[PDB]
Design a protein around this ligand. Structure first.
Ligand SMILES: [Mg+2]
Ligand SMILES: [Zn+2]
Ligand SMILES: [Zn+2]
Lengths: 447, 99, 100, 1337, 28
DNA sequence: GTGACTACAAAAAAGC
RNA sequence: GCUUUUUUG
DNA sequence: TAGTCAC
């Protein structure tokens, strides 16, 4: 039906609904439109535009696999019922679940798209959960991938990250989505904006998809409003169809919500991104991903403000699910005396938190939680009380803070090498811990 | 990752792979080209013969190096002979016409 | 909806019709912690109710009886952890959304 | 042990000689035991002993009966490795056809009989009958037959009727028939033949048979009747658990075929009827087919779980085939891999090593070292003590390291500088420590790339490593000309800071007694590093032959320059370092020393440069700070006006006065202008920032901005980066390639709008995607380049040839962008140099032009010379040294043996990474105008107008030097004359970008020979306001009217068709299509007056297509003949075009398109090799009509121009040598040795003719024509069959090599690699020559 | 110790004969 | 014009 | 062990 | 998938 609606929209139809099958008149209109295009009536489409690109999350993928298993068992059971017992049979024995179970299990556990999670860094795992791939069973091969799909469509602004992108044979195919971008129930990409009536910004938010971006004009967040939308000058920059120009104040009607919805969550932690080249931004984001935790993380001297949100939103850290005050603290478990109003009648228990300790990751790095609170102090519902790996006080922290001097020195920093004092290694500010796993089996042969 | 001598694969009489399970360093062919480009010939001969695929020489050199000798075996590679046999297997008359 | 796509099942000429009725999800057999401890999928069972209706042979659409097999064991389905991920055997994996 | 290989078919008797017995049963094992049968397939009696020095029964035990047979088991009591090679044979009851000649697409059997193979298969499997002259009057020997017809002929003749069956009958036929009368009859037929489709078939057949009769093989032997059996060691049969075996596919097919033989034997043992004889014979036929090649004809595996099995091809063909992977690309021991870092304290011939890698690599040498000293007793004791890290291990290892160089290479070994050698210096850590300077060769940044360490073993390898792969020896560029030890990234800034001049500082104006105490002043901190002091130094000059005379004087300089003079070596003038030294200069510096002092002084000079550069860069200190770079205030203000002006253009577009496209051009141009203005402003601000007063008044000087040193010294960055950092970032283009109209007004230091940032992203993503995708296609290119140029080993010094033409500096229209002096540098002269002084010879011939004669040319104004070229070297499968040139690896001439092809391929392919994938003439210099192809006539204005379309003008220096060169398009008026001394900035020729056609004789224009309206259309256009003449074509005008090729009749005052007097023709000029003439009728037109006016890629693809010589879309057609051109007719398609040569082949025409412009007319006196149309040209015609040397300068021009566009230089020797191998084939014009026209080796034909001429004097031999071939096709058609069998279609090459008796001489390189024998390129080449000279000589 | 063979190159120069003769001398 | 035959690394995992 | 697939540089 | 010679 989404395909049906897209088809009807492409043919300038009037309906939204439709059948799951074609009909003669539809193909007839297809020839008519193609011939008119050949004559020069209308214009060709563009696959790179987001309106023609859709995201299939876990939902419809699992639905597809489950339906395939369903029909696979259904043909057999229907045939057996037709040719078999009539009244002295139970549905349970004739029905089967092993083929469907095996199919969904293999789809979940082994696929070109079922990725393997990275655990080395909370930022790494968050940006891996946000990943979007044009690969896998339904995408396209590297050999047959055109050059244009590597490139950046002018409508990517605000939906997919123009920076976070791996380097190698597959570049521009694995870009992740921006921070504010949220999916639309039809599967398109939608981002927030702010309506403007004449010259005053509507505080209410307004979600906008890719296609409706075409017929509107949208300004930039850096535009300065006096007190209620009064722009600094009535001639301001804007954008209508992938182009920039100076437009009148009444010309524009939408505001972008903020400045961050252009960049990804992974790349929004780089401070002062406004001054370096795009390529260095790419590399910086990648080495941000590939960080490894230290034994005692330290707060970043210069940050971007998303540290709190990225730490709390990812579940690696332990957060106070229910408000109250702390009753007992331990290095391993946390007891929280819930507030009398926070609890609901009947269930009068108090909060328990069994923190994890050093356990193997998917990259042999170490995960633990040192409790970062004390006794007899307030806590709030949905507040951090335990800090996991590479974080502190609910703020992200991946490396350390060094004192640095930009100075050529006897060639030991000839091209890109680094000089390190004995002091940094002596106080152990970078020394990490890794966990290895060894497994031994016991088979039985003839001897 | 470093390797001197140890186990070899069953399928081919060559050292193992990867850092784990006692592997060895890979020698491509771009650098074969480059070694060709120099006057370097003896090193290429020795490496293709005794370092990787030889079994008789592999132990022979190892016994040769321990007693202070580093002299090769000035003869045709053994794999050439069996290779020759294969062409002689079909119907083909092949021989070293000039000795 | 996936059931509704295969909701009506009818014989060839046996006048026996199998239809979906209801579904519910059982509780996970093991919690996540032991799932990575032992190496099993953090899964949940599928329980479904099926109704079989049979008419008199060579007679109009008048059923004889309703065979109700409820809560049918319908395989196992992985449950997403609250963190937003799965575990296949003992290792944590995520499904990246595909763009097509 | 040998130096050549011959391959051919085998005879049954010598096949048995190969064998050592006859095998009877497939019994490879007996149950209840594990002993192969002495009469089975794994016959130890014929394969050899099962256990070392032991017979099958073991009655002889390893001391008393070694090497002798046993009485019980008929096997010699010897070692078991003979079993690895000992082999037998099987005798076939009935002969069978070797199916490869069956299964090859150019089937040898069918080509030999010229009769199809489909019936051959039928008769082979006994489905059709073959006659053997069944009747003397009805049919022939080679007709198929049916049993029903066989019965009919039996009743018909019977007595003379005889017709056997199958492969035995075919072999009887082949043996009965000869090939001599075949060869003479085919020679007679092809001599008098007209058919072309069968001509090629017949030529191939006659060639095959005439080679076969000379080969000596027998066709009957081709139909094998005895089959050899392989030694059992090759087929893996391990006894599995429960008495099972590995079931080698070889054993499956052996058992199958031997069972078929046994069944046929039993069938023939009772005189069985022929009804079952056919069945068993056919089945044995498929059995032998499956064994020899299964899956090709019947696909009858029948020995596996429905899967293909290794019969024979899997051991030859397929990636599992061990040839091209198991001798090309594999693992190796005695090697390690690790990360690299910077060792800025090491001499240039050293490298570091972590201790763990050291001990792991050398522990075999360690055991020998310990046991020789006797400290260890057993091998286990040595292993355990070295594992326990004793005290003696460290110093003994340090002893054994001292002379044992190791090899280092980055992963993508792009060229010969990829792999080097060093002496290890053991250190602590876990990373490889490299010299900084050599790090420029590997292109190995320190971003964490890994390098691999190898180690040679034998004394020969170690000595060769010391002699060749020391970093010292490999200094100059193998690519073109320069040291690869150019001072590296950091040292250059240190040198620049060393040598500056501040207007005033501490310690200025005094004098210093020398460089010795000069640093004393600086070290005490009493004088500035740079000052204005006066010091006296003593140097030497190489003016004395072998002596360095010392001279001294007082020279004004700075303190730092004295510090540098402290370490500069002896024989160099002081003026070379008097200037503010930069990156390019210091590089040149090294070159000078390398051309004066040698090698060791240069290398110690390089090490001193490194040490001083690092020391005084660290001591100096130069960071980058926010206030270090400064933005000009004017910039914003400046671009403000630009912004304003943009709005102005908008209003012109707002008014509708202008369209967007011209508005688009206007805005992009004004933005570019504003960018230029602001960039100039900020350069101006930075360059002269420093204004320091000296003794009162303030006075400016060169700036001391840290960025300004860091860039102006050229260590890093360029003008573009510095412009980006402060000024206008510029305007980027939208991804389709067109430039977006809004430049990014802000710079990096200031803020950025996110949209500006967003816009700039895809510009970077485009380039990054290009760099990502380039690493595959470019590398593969080099592969195609190496296979064609694989061998090309120089073999003899001089063949005495003296060919080549005029190696001259190409002038590129404007200023010439390369001189002669570098172009001929390193090339050896072919002809004697005649100084332009009336036979006052300056350089004798056969002399190397290194520098001295090169230094003798500039003062002699020599501007045109020729040198020997490898294309003009007529040896046999080699190159002459005095025809090759000077190898760039070492300053001396190329030695004997050093491979050239591989070096050339690598040098050509290395810059692929930097190789991206996607009206009038105004003189500018002073000289006298010079015109080539002078065809001009005085116009009505008294000046000169050309009438030759290929006219070309040049400007010559007053010293005889060419300075300019310009094409003169047809019908361009000349505002000057030849030889008139005119300075620059003066136009001399004028024309239009539509083209004019102009008369040659004066008089009226009596417009006859055209039909008004039909031929010429009197288009009275409103714009011109007159009834002009339009000579439309046949399709444009009326076809019936346009059936005479109208020509205007220019007449004199007498109204007559005036002729060029007696010489050529009347004034009739064939007016072409759309010949727009503005005259109406009968207006006087002088000679040379207008008649009409016709209204007329990426680097990597360019290189790749040029090396393939693939034809372009529009081949600019050429007049391959002389004479006077005419015009043909019009056909259903493109217009015919006939020519009228003044002699020779008068009736010549061609199929010429008419839609595209044809700047050719009747009055064109065509000559030998002049282009007809315009545009791209294929190499084929240029080669086949205007000589080989024409292309030689063509491909080199194109590729070197491309690389120069990319700013990369490679010496012209490398690019053209592959041409000498690219141009490796030819066709035969006149017969006498070959048949008529086969394309074969040109060098082979030349050597055949040259020897023939003295032997059979007077014979024409074979006049030929040297054609070209794509490098891919050149690889396919290589003479060496082994090279072909390496990587493609192994089946055929074996077939037509064996039947034709191919004898490979191993003249190549890859063939020597494939068989495992030593390569005869480097020290191997000396080895073989020494082996040949001593042994068998 | 020794690293440069420029003397041999300039007197008996051939990168192969000298290394081969050194090899056969050192084989003893 | 169309058809048979032919050709740079480390790590995670499936299928025998 | 081998074949293949994936992630990372 | 991209390249080759034959019917
Ligand atoms: Mg590195
Ligand atoms: Zn015996
Ligand atoms: Zn020569």
């Amino acid at each position: 039906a989404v395909g049906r609606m897209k088809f009807n929209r492409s043919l300038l139809r009037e309906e939204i609904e439709g059948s799951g099958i074609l009909s003669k008149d539809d193909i007839i209109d297809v020839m008519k439109k193609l011939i008119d295009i050949r004559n020069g009536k209308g214009e060709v489409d563009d696959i790179d535009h987001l309106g023609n690109r859709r995201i299939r999350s876990v939902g419809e993928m699992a639905e597809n696999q489950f339906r395939v298993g369903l029909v696979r068992v259904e043909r057999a059971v229907k045939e057996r019922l037709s040719l078999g017992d009539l009244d002295t049979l139970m549905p349970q024995d004739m029905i089967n679940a092993k083929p469907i179970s095996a199919a969904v299990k293999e789809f979940f556990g082994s696929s070109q798209l079922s990725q393997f999670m990275d655990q080395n860094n909370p930022l790494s795992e968050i940006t891996h959960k946000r990943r979007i791939s044009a690969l896998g069973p339904g995408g396209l091969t590297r050999e047959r991938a055109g050059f244009e799909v590597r490139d950046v469509h002018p409508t990517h602004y605000g939906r997919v990250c123009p920076i976070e992108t791996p380097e190698g044979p597959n570049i521009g195919l694995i870009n992740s989505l921006s921070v504010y971008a949220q999916t639309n129930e039809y599967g398109f990409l939608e981002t927030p904006y702010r309506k403007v009536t004449d010259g005053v910004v509507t505080d209410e938010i307004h979600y906008l998809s890719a296609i409706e971006e075409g017929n509107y004009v949208i300004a930039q967040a850096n535009s300065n409003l006096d007190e209620e939308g009064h722009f600094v000058e009535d001639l301001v920059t804007c954008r209508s169809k992938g182009e920039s120009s100076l437009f009148s104040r009444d010309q524009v009607d939408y505001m972008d919500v903020s400045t961050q919805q252009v960049v990804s969550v992974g790349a929004s932690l780089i401070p002062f991104l406004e001054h370096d080249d795009a390529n260095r931004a790419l590399m910086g984001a990648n080495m941000q991903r590939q960080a490894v935790p230290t034994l005692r993380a330290d707060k970043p001297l210069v940050g971007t403000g998303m540290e709190r949100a990225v730490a709390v939103d990812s579940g690696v850290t332990a957060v106070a699910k229910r408000g109250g005050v702390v009753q007992y603290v331990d290095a391993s478990r946390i007891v929280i005396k819930v507030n009398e109003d926070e609890m609901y009648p009947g269930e009068a228990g108090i909060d328990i938190y069994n923190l994890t300790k050093y356990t193997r990751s998917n990259q042999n790095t170490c995960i633990n939680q040192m409790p970062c609170v004390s006794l007899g102090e307030p806590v709030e519902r949905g507040d951090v009380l335990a800090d996991g790996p590479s974080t502190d006080l609910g703020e992200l922290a991946l490396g350390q803070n060094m004192r640095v001097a930009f100075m050529p020195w006897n060639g030991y920093n000839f091209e890109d090498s680094i000089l390190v004092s004995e002091r940094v290694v002596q106080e152990d500010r970078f020394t990490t811990i890794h966990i290895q796993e060894l497994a031994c089996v016991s088979r039985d042969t003839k001897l | 990752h470093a390797r001197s001598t140890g186990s070899y694969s069953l399928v081919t009489q060559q050292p193992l792979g990867g850092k784990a399970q006692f592997g060895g360093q890979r020698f491509g062919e771009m650098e074969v080209w480059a070694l060709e480009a120099y006057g370097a010939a003896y090193t290429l001969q020795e490496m293709l013969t005794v370092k990787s695929d030889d079994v008789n020489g592999r132990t022979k050199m190892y016994k040769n190096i321990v007693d202070g000798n580093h002299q090769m075996e000035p003869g045709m590679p053994e794999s050439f002979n069996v290779l020759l046999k294969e062409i002689r297997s079909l119907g083909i008359n092949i021989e070293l016409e000039d000795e | 909806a996936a059931f509704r796509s295969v909701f009506p099942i009818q014989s060839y000429s046996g006048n026996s019709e199998l239809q979906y009725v209801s579904y519910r999800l059982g509780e996970p057999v093991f919690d996540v912690q032991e799932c990575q401890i032992r190496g099993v999928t953090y899964s949940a069972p599928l329980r479904v109710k099926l109704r079989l209706v049979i008419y008199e042979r060579e007679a109009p659409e008048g059923t004889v009886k309703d065979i109700k097999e409820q809560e049918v064991y319908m395989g196992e389905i992985p449950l997403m952890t609250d963190n937003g991920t799965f575990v296949i055997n003992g290792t944590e994996r995520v499904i990246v959304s595909q763009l097509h | 042990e040998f130096d050549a290989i011959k391959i051919a078919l085998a005879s049954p008797d010598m096949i048995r000689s190969w064998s050592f017995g006859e095998v009877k049963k497939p019994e490879t094992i007996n149950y209840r035991t594990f002993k192969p049968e002495r009469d089975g397939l794994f016959c130890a009696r014929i394969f050899g002993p099962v256990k070392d020095y032991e017979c099958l029964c073991g009655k002889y035990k390893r001391l008393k009966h070694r090497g002798v047979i046993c009485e019980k088991c008929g096997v010699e009591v010897t070692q078991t490795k003979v079993r690895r090679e000992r082999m037998g044979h099987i005798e076939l009851a009935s002969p069978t056809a070797h199916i490869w000649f069956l299964k090859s697409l150019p089937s040898r059997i069918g080509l030999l009989l010229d009769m199809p193979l489909r019936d051959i298969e039928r008769v082979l499997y006994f489905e059709s009958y073959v006659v053997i002259e069944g009747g003397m009057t009805n049919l022939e020997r080679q007709q198929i037959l049916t049993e029903e017809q066989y019965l009919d002929a039996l009743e018909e003749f019977g007595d003379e009727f005889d017709a056997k069956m199958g492969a035995e009958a075919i072999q009887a036929l082949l043996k009965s028939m000869d090939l001599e009368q075949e060869c003479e009859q085919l020679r007679e037929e092809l001599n008098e033949t007209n058919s072309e489709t069968k001509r090629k078939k017949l030529t191939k057949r006659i060639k095959l048979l005439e080679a076969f009769v000379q080969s000596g093989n027998k066709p009957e032997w081709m139909i094998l009747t005895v089959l050899p059996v392989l030694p059992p060691d090759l087929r893996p049969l391990v006894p599995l658990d429960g008495g099972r075996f590995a079931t080698s596919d070889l054993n499956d097919l052996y058992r199958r075929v031997i069972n078929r033989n046994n069944r046929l034997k039993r069938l023939l043992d009772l005189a069985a009827p022929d009804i079952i004889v056919r069945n068993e014979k056919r089945m044995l036929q498929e059995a032998v087919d499956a064994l020899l090649d299964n899956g090709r004809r019947g696909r009858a595996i029948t020995g596996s779980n429905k899967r293909p099995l290794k019969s024979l091809a899997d051991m030859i063909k397929g990636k599992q085939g061990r040839f091209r992977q198991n001798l090309l690309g594999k693992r190796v021991d005695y090697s390690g891999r690790s990360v690299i870092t910077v060792g800025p304290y090491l001499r240039l011939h050293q490298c570091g090593l972590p201790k763990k890698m050291a001990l792991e690599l050398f522990k075999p040498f360690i055991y020998g070292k310990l046991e020789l000293r006797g400290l260890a007793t057993t091998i286990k004791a040595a292993k355990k003590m070295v594992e326990r890290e004793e005290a003696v291990v460290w110093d003994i290892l340090d002893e054994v390291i001292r002379e044992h160089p190791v090899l280092l290479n980055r992963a993508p070994t792009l060229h010969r500088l990829g792999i080097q050698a060093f002496e290890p210096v053991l250190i602590e850590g876990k990373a490889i420590q490299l010299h900084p300077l050599v790090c420029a060769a590997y292109n190995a940044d320190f971003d964490g790339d890994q390098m691999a360490v190898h180690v040679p073993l034998t004394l020969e390898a170690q000595l060769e490593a010391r002699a060749l792969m020391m970093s010292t020896n490999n200094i100059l560029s193998p690519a073109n000309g320069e040291p690869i030890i150019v001072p590296s990234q950091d040292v250059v800034l240190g040198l620049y800071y060393m040598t500056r001049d501040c207007v005033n500082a501490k310690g200025e104006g005094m004098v210093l007694t020398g460089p010795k105490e000069a640093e004393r002043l600086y070290r005490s901190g009493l004088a500035s590093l740079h000052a204005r002091v006066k010091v006296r130094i003593t140097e030497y000059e190489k003016d004395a032959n072998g002596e360095l005379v010392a001279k001294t004087s007082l020279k004004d300089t700075t303190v730092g320059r004295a510090i540098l003079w402290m370490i500069v070596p002896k024989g160099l003038p002081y003026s070379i370092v008097n200037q503010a030294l930069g990156k390019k200069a210091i590089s040149k510096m090294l070159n000078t020393c390398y051309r004066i002092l040698g090698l060791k002084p240069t290398v110690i000079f390089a090490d001193q440069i490194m040490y001083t550069g690092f020391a005084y860069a660290a001591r100096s200190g130069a960071s980058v700070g926010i206030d270090d770079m400064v933005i000009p205030e004017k910039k914003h203000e400046i671009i403000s006006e630009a912004e304003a002006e943009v709005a102005e253009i908008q209003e012109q577009f707002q008014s509708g006065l202008v369209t967007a496209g011209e508005r688009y051009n206007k805005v992009i141009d004004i933005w570019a202008a504003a960018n230029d203005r602001v960039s100039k402003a900020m350069m101006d601000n930075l360059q002269t920032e420093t204004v320091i007063n000296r003794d009162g008044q303030e006075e400016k000087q060169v700036s001391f901005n840290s960025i300004y040193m860091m860039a102006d010294s050229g260590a890093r960055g360029s003008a573009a980066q510095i412009r980006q950092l402060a000024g206008m970032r510029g305007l980027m283009a939208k991804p389709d390639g067109s430039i977006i109209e809004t430049p990014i007004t802000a710079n990096f230091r200031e803020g950025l709008n996110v949209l500006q940032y967003f816009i700039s992203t895809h510009g970077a993503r485009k380039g990054l995607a290009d760099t990502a995708l380039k690493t595959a296609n470019s590398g593969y290119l080099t592969r195609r380049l190496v296979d064609v140029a694989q061998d090309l080993v120089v073999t003899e010094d001089d063949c005495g040839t003296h060919e080549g033409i005029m190696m001259t500096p190409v002038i590129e229209g404007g200023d010439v962008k390369e001189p002669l002096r570098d172009r001929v540098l390193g090339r050896v002269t072919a002809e004697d140099v005649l100084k332009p002084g009336t036979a006052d010879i300056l350089v004798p011939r056969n002399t190397l032009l290194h520098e001295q004669w090169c230094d003798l040319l500039e003062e002699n104004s020599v501007d045109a010379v020729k040198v020997r070229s490898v294309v003009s070297c007529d040896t046999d499968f080699g190159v002459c040294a005095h025809c090759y040139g000077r190898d760039l690896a070492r300053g001396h001439i190329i030695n004997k043996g050093e491979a050239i092809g591989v070096i050339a391929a690598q040098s050509i392919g290395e810059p692929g990474t930097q190789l991206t994938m996607r009206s009038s003439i105004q003189v500018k210099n002073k000289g006298s105008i010079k015109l080539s192809n002078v065809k001009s006539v005085v116009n009505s204005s008294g000046k000169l107008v050309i009438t030759s379309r290929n006219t070309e003008l040049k400007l010559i220096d007053e010293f005889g030097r060419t300075k300019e060169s310009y094409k003169v398009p047809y019908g361009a008026v000349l505002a000057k004359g030849d030889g008139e001394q005119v300075a620059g900035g003066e136009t001399v020729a004028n024309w239009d970008p539509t083209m004019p056609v102009i008369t040659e004789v004066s008089g009226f224009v009596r417009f006859t020979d055209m039909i008004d309206g039909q031929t010429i259309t009197r288009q009275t256009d409103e714009l011109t306001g007159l009834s002009s003449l339009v000579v439309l074509d046949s399709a444009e005008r009326t076809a019936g009217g346009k059936d005479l090729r109208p020509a205007l009749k220019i007449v004199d005052a007498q109204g007559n068709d005036v002729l060029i007097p007696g010489t050529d023709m009347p004034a009739q000029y064939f007016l072409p299509g759309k010949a727009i003439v503005q005259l109406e009728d009968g207006v006087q037109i002088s000679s040379g007056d207008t008649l009409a006016r016709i209204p007329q890629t990426g680097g990597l693809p360019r290189v790749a297509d040029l090396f393939e010589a693939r034809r372009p879309k529009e081949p600019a057609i050429l007049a391959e003949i002389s004479g006077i051109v005419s015009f043909g007719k019009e056909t259903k398609g493109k217009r015919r075009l006939v020519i009228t040569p003044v002699d020779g082949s008068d009736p010549y025409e061609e199929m010429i398109p008419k839609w595209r412009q044809l700047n050719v007319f009747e009055g064109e006196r065509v000559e030998r090799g002049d282009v007809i149309s315009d545009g791209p040209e294929a190499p084929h015609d240029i080669l086949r009509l205007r000589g080989v040397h024409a292309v030689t300068r063509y491909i080199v021009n194109e590729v070197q121009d491309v690389y120069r566009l990319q700013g990369v230089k490679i010496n012209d020797k490398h690019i053209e040598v592959i041409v000498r191998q690219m141009l490796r084939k030819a066709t035969i014009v006149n017969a006498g040795s070959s048949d008529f026209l086969e394309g074969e080796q040109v060098e082979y034909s030349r050597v055949k003719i040259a020897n023939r001429e003295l032997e059979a004097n007077g014979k024409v031999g074979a006049t030929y024509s040297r054609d070209l071939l794509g490098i891919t096709k050149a690889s396919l058609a290589t003479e060496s069959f082994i090279s072909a069998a390496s990587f493609q279609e192994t089946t055929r090459v074996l077939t037509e090599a064996a039947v034709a008796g191919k004898r490979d001489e191993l003249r190549g390189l890859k063939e020597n690699v494939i068989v495992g024998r030593l390569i005869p390129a480097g020290t191997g080449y000396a080895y073989h020559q020494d082996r040949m000279r001593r042994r068998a000589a | 110790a020794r690293v440069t063979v420029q003397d041999a190159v300039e007197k008996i120069g051939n990168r192969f004969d000298l290394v081969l003769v050194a090899a056969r001398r050192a084989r003893q």
